[model samples]
Target chain A: VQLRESGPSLVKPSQTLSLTCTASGFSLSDKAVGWVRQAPGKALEWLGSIDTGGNTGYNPGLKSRLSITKDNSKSQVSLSVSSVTTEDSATYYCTTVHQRTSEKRSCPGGSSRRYPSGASCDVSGGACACYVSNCRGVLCPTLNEIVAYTYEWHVDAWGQGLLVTVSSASTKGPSVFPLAPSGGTAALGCLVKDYFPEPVTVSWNSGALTSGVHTFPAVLQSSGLYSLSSVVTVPSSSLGTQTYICNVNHKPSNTKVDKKVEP
Target chain B: NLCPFGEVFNATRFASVYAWNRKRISNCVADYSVLYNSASFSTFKCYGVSPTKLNDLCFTNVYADSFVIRGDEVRQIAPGQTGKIADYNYKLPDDFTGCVIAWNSNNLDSKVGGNYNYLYRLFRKSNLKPFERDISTEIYQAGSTPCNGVEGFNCYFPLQSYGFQPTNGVGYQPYRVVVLSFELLHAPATVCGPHH
Candidate 1:
């Protein structure tokens, strides 16, 4: 149960923050060890845990940028976080818990089970249900009987809301403009960046037009940011007559970006 | 019940349990001590990672038998994941025969059911068998680092092996298993049952 945390004291903004927790007096494979961090003046943040089972849990806030793991040969736990900023500077530590298993109830040929630790466990249909309060709901499987289980962490319980940079949607082009002999169409693109907690939507609107505008799904950028581009084909007939505006909405950000079509 | 049992649906001919978009049967745990009898049944439940990032963790109580998983899923081990392979924690029951694996996954969300270019493979492992995926080789190359020499929270290598060494090329990475319902010749009787 002895653990020590070690890592660089100062991390450059936008660089990866790496840390290690060396454990002693306990087996890395038998116990579930958790990673915790605290900013200079803030409360402790439970980044997540990696148990002996090789199972991992991470706070959703840092999910894409945070990784928690362990090495048994050297008796250690590790945490690596990428894209660090001034806000990410913190002291990190790891902790482990003693767990015991018991039978909660019995069925026809077998019995239900309980861990009595962080989660509640029940057995039915030859599978185990380990539910946690922080986890929105259900929670493994195996052989002779055929079973399946997965550990899932949702955004709401894992940590803070998504971080998105919201501004007026930036519109570009008729990246392709017309060669109109009879009639042609104009293409418009609206750009939205850094929005998260997705299921993000972008739409086109004008005087009376509300629906039927084709909008593309937002694509996640390589840097963990989000980029959304939408095209509205304005009939050559209404090229200058039509005025279309784009609206980008991100749920978690609670902010919408509105940009008027130019090209 | 927030977290209900599969039998509860079996308790219902086919109501809310098997219903559609109206009710969300989210966050459920299944116990497979018993195998399905005679027929194969299926559910529309498409298992995808939640919108928030999700890394599935398995905890088991069945301590009698040590579980064996082919190495495909080992993204959680530390520094050089090779540091610990012995006495790894977590528990589960039963045995597995095959699994649908996704590899070379950079930028792929934790959830399934989407189209991606990552290498998708099928493989199986069990306590009684060799730990290898569908690759032609018996043993996999051990100690091969993924993400092209750059490792850490961002290693997006298709197959991130979890141990100091891959036992027979197939055994190094973390993997999922698919098992069919089967009966045990003899059920171990336990005191946990009853005083009846």
Candidate 2:
């Protein structure tokens, strides 16, 4: 019958930001819900959220980089932001809006069954179903109950917030892998490691036959470090004369690493 | 007290959502549980190995305030709500083919170490403002205490590894970010507006 958000106040710059909204004492589908972020010592910034029918809206500036999802049985909402920076620092908040209604589970029929979107939970003893787009789940909750719950509010009631700080870190990448263990005719690989905060990049140099190059996102290591790899494909005939170089750059520090293939 | 319960209830719920969301989100990338893999619904991210458990569930996990993309619209699913793979009845979005469980996980946590301090503050104190902390030279002893039943003190989250289908050689889901949305409830004037 209630909703709230939780998250971290400090994030390394260029790192991903994750958050969640939990609902209980009420069905998560029962109300209009979503998350919002505010600039430090400033005002609120709408991030994104989904409605009962799986409808969604965002603050445009972050429509692409944000991911929002929810769990029915747990009655929670989740969010993630990639490549966060100090400019992205803010105090995030979860917002829920809905009028108080009787707590009852419904049989919406077929795919839409058990309960309605933004609907309150059933009060003890009732089979309830939940849905989000093409997927669905059921919650009998042992049909737990014993309560009267109602929540209706305007947009601004949320004064509480979760702080987000982006720490600047180092980056490493442009790792090199010259051969495929599976046995390939012409291929080379480069790697970058021990990088921090992401948005890592890679590039190739001097290649007419092995000109095709591909780079990947920085992969975080268990030691709290990050690494990246890139591969190039060259024709066997031109392998001897082709001079291939992998240049890896970490933006947080403007650091770059270049390695040339000894052809 | 038209809506005396609204503020307190709302604040607590919001805090809970953020608390869980943060932890769940961090797990998706932090854990490195990928093993042998291939193309299959619920395919292996870490094959031939005992995969890590997120809470009570293995591999598949549920999330709060989560979303998915179906055709042109972003839909949401709540619950993993866990233990059982969420098998919702289906209508493929603009696709004409077979079906496979589109796998996703909720591993909420921060990408770096220093953020733990702020997460601790926000989760327990409901404090949103950031405070300075020394990244290096800070011997932050990491440990958890017995469940005293304190509101936020009872949480149990540790650094662990997690991987997805791609880790097992299977491709990834087409859509991860479900559009975010909510519902509407009735409001009486007294408790509905400011100055309740």
Candidate 3:
């Protein structure tokens, strides 16, 4: 009754977006699994669904580029979207349908009679009569009883969504600045701007330092690009003799820009 | 203290109604709400596959602080009290549907603090002053209910109204580009926020 979704967090434009959903505590054979996604600040949109029986359905607008499949043995479902664009950047969720049943009873002619186990009943003369031995050994001949079952289906199980951001590569490099030196330390600031797909990494030439370094999360600017700032501190004594290099690594573009600064 | 909750993972439009008047209505109004799992008091866990069981998964304990942002100004709306519902009548004018609605759960464990540290600090250092106003609320645990026929969602915010045609030949306009950001929680934590 649990599900988990996993996928790449970033994808370049025109590339295929792939996501997988793994399920547990339930069999996928009897359930219909589907994919739903929500664009930034938009409502949820259903992409498609697939059942173990190989039945599939998809949104007509994206049917040509969308595909859904499942692996019953692994209790998994997968989604693929081709030629992705920035509009496709969204949080995708994997959900399954759960069925519930309810029973209803009815008696005819205002007469109710109890029936024995293993007895079949038939409706006749506005009443239901039960007979245990093909009516030869009639049990509760004046019985009037009927039971009906109702089934309801709803989406009850879902995974934490997987987000995919589709955009172009970063073409610009980061800007490095050396701040004024304090009592014993000098600070260096690096600003990476106008980048797409917010997974850029910032590193200092000093390597992974435990203290005196702070890298802020990528923030979305109004221009639809992302910006991040990182500040690193070094000893004031080294400002005149040492140079700090700020390396900005963008995986989607496979490019790394380095800027050297001296305070 | 609020129990450890997760992110405001997902939001969906659950219900919509139209208002008819003699004069043309040039705007659309909406109501936003949030759902959380208060029974566990710990992190959220999937209990069962039935609606009845899933319905039992949520209880109201924490508070929801909602906001609406336009340009550089962020305004706090009616607070979501213990009822776990926030009601705000927003008028989306014909010329401007670009206002953004944002919210997060409050009264979380003080040890973990708010979930968006880098963003919070970055906003505080930026020119946009209001963005740093509500940096204390944390969306630590992920919890949601069925929304618009789908499940696994915690908040409801509508981008457009049902059957409403735009008079200005424009659709929904987002005030700010929504981006995903992660936070590092203390030990005994499995995942992080801003879910969506």
Candidate 4:
């Protein structure tokens, strides 16, 4: 490599300028890198840094991609969309993406398995080990190939990688939907389908029945909504009403039906 | 054929080290001196991304020729039968941590061979000439590595984000300006110089 300069001695120093820091002679090591801007008239402002480890840090108020990583061993650092607003423009300088203030990741070369500052992924058939910092989950593919292939845990905790499957079997809500009685006294004998789990429900409305709920004990196939069949027998000539509604409450949005069976 | 005005005419060329894989490229532009260097190889370029990707792998170029640059600018390059031009300073902006990535000065290098040698300067934006000639040298290694099935190898500097800096007060920034000013020291010899 060579020592280089960016100016011909005439880059209007007052104008905020950008600089870069790159390296050679090594491969990339996951790490945190950053930028610093200094001009002819002030102290250097710590431009946010990026951890090649995959974590990102911005000045919070500043606008920039402010990310860092290694291009092979050639460690590179750059900035863009320079905010040429007032408080900027100068003969800026560049330096290594420092870790003085923060716990920095190591940007090195060679296959020492040096995890990029914050790398996280689930290992496969070989090891359950992973290399992820500030991570949230494991690699789904690796888990499926190596660890327990249980999908419930895989769907909830994975962070970066995914394995998608496409098929017709995934559609059509569920094998069979169930409707159950919500609260109070209710008879369990109504709205039952062949494949549907045990009891069913059918609540009515004749001016006497306001709004009520229904519950079931079936495992909510990851959707959290339960299905069952139970009918609440209302005692009276309320059958003289217009419509009766079957309401099953599932969080988020409601799933119910109104049957205006003229009695 | 160099220009009449004389400047430092070193037959060798040098560039800075960078990462080929990590550097992001936004755009590419032809060096302005293409017209004058009718030799089909005298040109310089500034890559828009840090450790610019040369065909997807990181690499830098060298500057050669012997003509004084009227306007101090990276307008031309001479990558002729030149070996790696080591020990040079490629200055970067203090504020430019991620300003932009650029690569140029290869009309000559590509014609000769993608063998480039660059140096990182020790001078901060505040300093004029590099640290009393103190420079941190980097290299551009060439070994045909198939990137995506195309015969292209990466060339870049693996910047350790957490390396201990000698200038602790002088923090690090990566947005850099790669300058390749024309040198006319041997103008008459390489260009306007005697056709030796």
Candidate 5:
């Protein structure tokens, strides 16, 4: 059985993605297709599943169905369930096993996340969460890699060093994934864990790592030590190892970790 | 009947008809839709164009048991739509009687601005009950061409009549059953639909 996901793996709480899971090993005759979501800090939720024989199984939590179909002798599964809300965010994956109508669904291994669309809304949250409703926005849903991080950190005047974590409190936007510059510009996200509010910063220090057009934002790759995104531009020049500090900017603020990024 | 059917939503006589937000060529393939952004809140409009039009690329003779609709054209099909239908042109047929356009639009984001306005035309075919005369009608009219010198035709509001069941948003799904339908004759016609 073969499978591939078509939508952007990273999205905010209110974005829409069209995902497909086609299989070559077997047809969807008796097998039902299913999707599950897994994130850095959360458990998995069975998104939904569908069978080629026209039967469907859905996770009550996600109001969409899980249908599977492919061209005769074809290997790709195509999926499109709309009106995305963000509870439906996260990576999504499907199973290629055969169907047994009795709560007996057997497919292979793989964990993908699938978050729905919407905001603190159920819309009571603030503005960032509430978006332009369905009409799609100006943000290109492409992925970029985190070339380098510039920040000031403090290891601690004494011991028990600090930890770093990047989190997303909303759905449908970009998920924080750690990226390596040696790779293409796959959108970089950070899902750091067990850290208090800021005292730390994550920036792009191109002068130390990347080179010209010679332009960059004013080091705003930070939030409440909370949710943040870096709109950085890196030229072809400095794309490698440098002392790009993870400035904590607090008491132990200059403690630097020289993580060498390979080109 | 070319008379505009009005809907009294919220005590206001919303005279409208089933006008296009886009031209639909395929069944279940939703024609283009209008973006009612200014109307407070509006979602997507999936229009099912009948394949009876000779000009319709996806035209296939509608069956005798097909479901029809009657939608008020508070909003007409505009070329600026984000869907494919906006690019096509529409005209009303001369043998026109009246028509119906159904819509499943709901959960609106606005209270007062749900309906949009545009020049719309309705073209529908009917299945005679073995003994009924074949009748065809185009109620709403708009665009560059006209059947009888009525170009740039604009009916205030066009309405659509659906056979009861709603489209499930899938491809080639069978429409609801039609049970001897009737039309709401245009302003000048004496008889409205295929029947008396």
Candidate 6:
């Protein structure tokens, strides 16, 4: 019933990342509100939900750039994520939705009441056996009432999170390539083009001549920037006495870029 | 059996409860009263901070009626005792390997004498993600007895204090412990059952 998560902690990739979840002791007019994120350790991205009749629910892989809105006279709940990138850099949280109700007891009429303890009613079929089918009664003993309705769109009151660092600006640093030798192993392709807020730390100044390492997945270039690759096999007899450097640190361009290779 | 607002999941009402992925906060207390119905209640423990074997403290029990006000500081939980809003001697920051605690109560019946209690610190950085915080302050009283054993309301810090900067990864960092009830008629009585 209490949330607070204003926006802007720095965002600039494709722009548009706005956020706000300010509520106070509750009242977003019937309330449903949502927008949960996390990306600095990842996973926990609901990215949509808004009710009170305006009805909306998303995360079908971020429904066309996510959007959730509400403002019951300023009890607020807003989140927009149009264009933004750096994988949308996250930490956003502003949620509220709660519901729970559970109860279960089965024997649906398929008969179930194993005897033996006090063992009494044996109406023509051992202890109880109707096994459903047409059920001409061997003992159906009436006991059917199952009601279970559980809805916990949880995050009951959140918002202390609003990191959003979709940054940009790395321009250059990281290009290494060598890849040749076969079975004896020897390869080093660093390539890390146009970065912008995506984490980068690709190291290896001879971790005992490594032998295997692979790091892809970072492509986002449509000019919005970001591209990555990392390979590092080394062991072609320690490739010419070993001097392999690679490096690349780049914390949003704090720059470190190495790259020796020496064969 | 009907558990929604009339609350009753009675496994002997959680048998003796205490099991939210324990690591030792005194084994995560709660031998009795932790209800949200029979008139809002509280009584649960778990506090062990400082090096504490690198980290592993978990707890999740949230029953609400309305509790969320920042700045004016809100941290209440006396009336049977059990409140230790993170601070077991501070420590944590060697890369924060663990911490996930959530204890927020609103004492139900629409703010009886303004009952309040809030504490949530989801820290799991070591590259596992999640770094939520709200250390709580404002005379922070709630059966205060060396609970977190005295020290700021420490949930530990240092991810640049808050600006954050330490992503690489090792393991253990994933959290989401949510159990809520703001009771605006308990969300339409979970679609009509707690008797609208």
DockQ of each: 0.01, 0.01, 0.00, 0.01, 0.01, 0.01
The sequence of per-residue lDDT tens digits that candidate 4 reaches over residues A124-152 is 22223333222211221111121222211
What does the i-RMS of model 6 come to?
Answer: 30.4
How far residue B189's Cα lies from its native spot in candidate 1, in Å, is: 61
lDDT of each: 0.39, 0.42, 0.47, 0.30, 0.30, 0.44
For candidate 2, the docking band is: incorrect
DockQ of candidate 1 compared with the true complex: 0.01
Could you give candidate 3's per-residue lDDT for residues A125-231 as a string of tens digits? 32224322221111223443578789765677777887787756544434434344337876777877776665677788746554777888878888777788888
Tell me the TM-score of each prediction against the true structure.
0.24, 0.25, 0.35, 0.18, 0.23, 0.21
Worst 10 residues of 6 chain B by lDDT: B157-166
For candidate 6, the clash count comes to 2
RMSD of 5: 32.0
List, residue by residue over A171-235, the lDDT tens digit for candidate 2: 33334343331344576777666655555567776333234676666666887676777777666
**Which of candidates 3 and 4 reaches a greater TM-score?**
3
Give per-residue lDDT, candidate 5, residue A106.
Answer: 20
Residue-by-residue lDDT tens digits, candidate 5, A39-142: 42668655555556655556665654444445434545555555444445444555554334222222122211111111122221111122222211112121
- Local error of candidate 2 at A178, Å? 60
Q: Lowest-scoring 10 consecutive residues by lDDT in candidate 3 chain B?
A: B17-26
Better of 2 and 3 by lDDT: 3
Per-residue lDDT of model 3, residues B1-196, tens digit only: 2222222223221111111011111111111122243332112212112222322222212122222122121221111211101112222222221122233222221112111111111101112121122222221222333334221124112211211112211121111111111112243322212221
What is the docking quality class of candidate 6?
A: incorrect
Please give the lDDT score at residue A23 for candidate 5.
50
**Which portions of model 3 miss their true places by more than 4 Å?**
A1-17, A20-34, A46-66, A72-76, A82-87, A94-162, A165-188, A202-224, A232-248, A256-263, B1-196
Query: How many backbone clashes does every candidate have?
Result: 40, 98, 7, 123, 106, 2
Give Cα distance to truth, residue A197, candidate 5, Å: 22
Between candidates 1 and 4, the one scoring higher on lDDT is: 1
What TM value does model 4 have?
Answer: 0.18
Residue B86 lDDT, candidate 3, scale 0-100 = 14
Candidate 4 Cα outliers beyond 4 Å, as residue runs: A1-19, A24-27, A64-70, A97-263, B1-196
TM-score of 3: 0.35
